[PDB]
Amino acid sequence: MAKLTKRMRVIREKVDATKQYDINEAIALLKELATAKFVESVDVAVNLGIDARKSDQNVRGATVLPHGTGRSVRVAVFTQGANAEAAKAAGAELVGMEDLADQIKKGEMNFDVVIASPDAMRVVGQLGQVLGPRGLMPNPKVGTVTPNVAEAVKNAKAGQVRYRNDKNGIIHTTIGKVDFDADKLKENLEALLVALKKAKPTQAKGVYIKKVSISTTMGAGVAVDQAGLSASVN
Amino acid sequence: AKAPIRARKRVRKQVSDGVAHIHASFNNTIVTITDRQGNALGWATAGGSGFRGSRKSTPFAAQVAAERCADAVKEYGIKNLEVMVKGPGPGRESTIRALNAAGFRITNITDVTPIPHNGCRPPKKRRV
RNA sequence: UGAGCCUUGAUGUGUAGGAUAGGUGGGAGGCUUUGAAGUGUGGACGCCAGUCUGCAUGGAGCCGACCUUGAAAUACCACC
Numbered sequence: 001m002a003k004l005t006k007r008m009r010v011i012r013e014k015v016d017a018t019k020q021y022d023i024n025e026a027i028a029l030l031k032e033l034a035t036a037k038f039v040e041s042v043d044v045a046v047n048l049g050i051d052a053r054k055s056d057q058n059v060r061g062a063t064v065l066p067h068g069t070g071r072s073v074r075v076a077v078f079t080q081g082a083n084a085e086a087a088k089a090a091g092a093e094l095v096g097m098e099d100l101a102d103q104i105k106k107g108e109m110n111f112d113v114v115i116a117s118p119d120a121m122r123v124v125g126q127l128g129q130v131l132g133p134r135g136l137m138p139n140p141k142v143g144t145v146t147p148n149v150a151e152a153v154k155n156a157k158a159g160q161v162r163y164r165n166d167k168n169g170i171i172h173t174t175i176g177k178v179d180f181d182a183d184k185l186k187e188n189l190e191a192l193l194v195a196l197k198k199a200k201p202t203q204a205k206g207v208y209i210k211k212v213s214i215s216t217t218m219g220a221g222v223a224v225d226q227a228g229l230s231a232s233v234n
Numbered sequence: 235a236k237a238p239i240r241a242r243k244r245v246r247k248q249v250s251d252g253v254a255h256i257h258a259s260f261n262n263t264i265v266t267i268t269d270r271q272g273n274a275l276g277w278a279t280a281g282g283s284g285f286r287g288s289r290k291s292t293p294f295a296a297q298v299a300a301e302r303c304a305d306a307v308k309e310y311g312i313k314n315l316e317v318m319v320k321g322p323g324p325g326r327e328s329t330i331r332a333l334n335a336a337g338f339r340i341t342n343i344t345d346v347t348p349i350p351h352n353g354c355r356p357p358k359k360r361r362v
Numbered sequence: 363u364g365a366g367c368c369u370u371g372a373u374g375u376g377u378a379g380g381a382u383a384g385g386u387g388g389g390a391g392g393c394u395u396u397g398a399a400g401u402g403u404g405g406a407c408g409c410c411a412g413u414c415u416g417c418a419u420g421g422a423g424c425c426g427a428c429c430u431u432g433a434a435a436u437a438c439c440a441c442c
Binding site for chain 3: 163
Binding site for chain 2: 374407
């Protein structure tokens, strides 16, 4: 669903209603709604029946999906206490503090996971910051760190994503590239709906999934029908 | 987001023009600015300008009522007056002088004291 | 004429800054109706260097990240 400014308009001439499709036509339209010169990564937006407004009572965790996500599997670790060399050898591309803060603030921003150890997290989010709170950074408030760097990278390189919310019923997560088929997308959706049920907070509803949509980066969104694994009346 | 401004960025009227009607009475003085159609827009008094009975009847108390009345209509964005006068009280020229000197424009002075063709019997006070 | 429900355009709390880091996550110089860049300049909003908006104008062009506010960023999306 298109947004207007004088500075960027290109999404306006790709959509013309707030309307919901079967998934076999939602991805058919979304391969048109890409606006950028580069072929775009595609995301779900998973809207939730959650009533939490406190960061700790909103959803938080991570998972590995059956198919790819258009995420890079380039992996970075902030650390000054935990096993740097065991992390790098476990398949991390990047380790540091002095220029990792710049690397994330340059070039292509398309990280699959930026990890911290809690040894370094102090200056990553709480007292210091290095990118500001955003999904691209490990979150200053919710649990996104471990002192088991060599495990965390070995999970991450599998194309695992990251989900959390803070004050709003939102998990946005990359699910493919826009060239994906509607079965690859539905099969990553069914995998993620297991993983949100397993990492469900007390303040979420029975009808835990409000609505699901699919949206590319520079380009527009369309809405999808699917909400699977989460009906209350059984 | 930063802190808000010290003085307002907008103002709800800008009517420019009005009439000061003065009732300079024998014990007080009352000043009211009204639009050109006679609907009153704001007002002030001698006695309400910090003077009791003993002081409110003077041209100096009236002079301050005129300033407090200029401030009373300040918000309507009026600046231009002409002037109308009634009553025996001395609030009749000290008012105009401090009004014109309080950033307002006096332009005309006309009396509007009502006089009869004989009329009804006057009151008696102090066997006068 | 009051209120709600709703959709959208506008709007953004970390303070400061020229200003405007709501949340979450993705991603980075982009077209097909339009124009922002940038120069000049009217409108509106605001904090005085800003944002929102328009015209002369480019319309295969162009603002991010450098610069700069700050502990920390800032093309540009979708979702609520």
